[PDB]
């Protein structure tokens, strides 16, 4: 027995999500391990990901909520802060994590990242450069990848 506090907290967030569903996202375990969740979010409106369905994985550590969950995209996405393995560069998942944060807030932050990328802290520098210098080319590719992979 190692993760009692994590599991109690993970269970509370799960039931909190069920009592008050998020507008733009869903999250919960799809298998038989409470440490491993799947999540889905809508690409935000006024963004090139609008209308896409993006699936994510959530892996809670056994010392959650003191350490952040490991969150990654399974759906392919064209984005300066998300690489081809689905890894996400997001501050609240690295060192701005606080135990007061929840999966609910993480999903909101990921949605905010899709609306407004952080090209000065990129995971894919070449995509960040296109975002910075040719916005419409980035918008075109992001839209095309939303149709190809998230629809």
């Amino acid at each position: 027995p190692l993760g009692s506090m994590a599991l109690k907290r993970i269970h509370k967030e799960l039931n909190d999500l069920a009592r008050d569903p998020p507008a733009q996202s869903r999250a919960g375990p799809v298998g038989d391990d409470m440490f491993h969740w799947q999540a889905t979010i809508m690409g935000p409106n006024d963004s090139p990901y609008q209308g896409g369905v993006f699936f994510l994985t959530i892996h809670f550590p056994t010392d959650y909520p003191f350490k952040p969950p490991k969150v990654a995209f399974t759906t392919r996405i064209y984005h300066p802060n998300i690489n081809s393995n689905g890894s996400i560069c997001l501050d609240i998942l690295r060192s701005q994590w606080s135990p007061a944060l929840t999966i609910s807030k993480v999903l909101l932050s990921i949605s905010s990242l899709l609306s407004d990328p952080n090209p000065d802290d990129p995971l894919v520098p070449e995509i960040a450069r296109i975002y910075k210098t040719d916005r419409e080319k980035y918008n075109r590719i992001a839209r095309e990848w939303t149709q190809k992979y998230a629809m």
Partner: protein, 74 residues
């Protein structure tokens, strides 16, 4: 440092249980009765599509902490 398992149903929120590997399925069914009011002889417990039999224990089924069981009425 304690063990927790979970019980998924079609109609109720995820149930959390506090258990030990030596607990038997009857014990788990008994704890389900306290939290949901469902009698043990009416409960069928499933882990990884395997039927859970009352005489066994959780360590028999390799149910670790954080495992999610399925509950259906019988």
């Amino acid at each position: 440092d304690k063990m927790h398992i979970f019980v998924r149903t079609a109609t109720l929120l995820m149930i959390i249980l506090e258990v030990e590997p030596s607990d038997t399925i009857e014990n788990v069914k008994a704890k389900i009765q306290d939290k949901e009011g469902i009698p043990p002889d009416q409960q069928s417990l499933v882990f990884r599509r395997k039927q859970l039999e009352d005489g066994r224990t959780l360590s028999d089924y390799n149910i670790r902490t954080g495992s999610i069981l399925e509950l259906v009425l019988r």
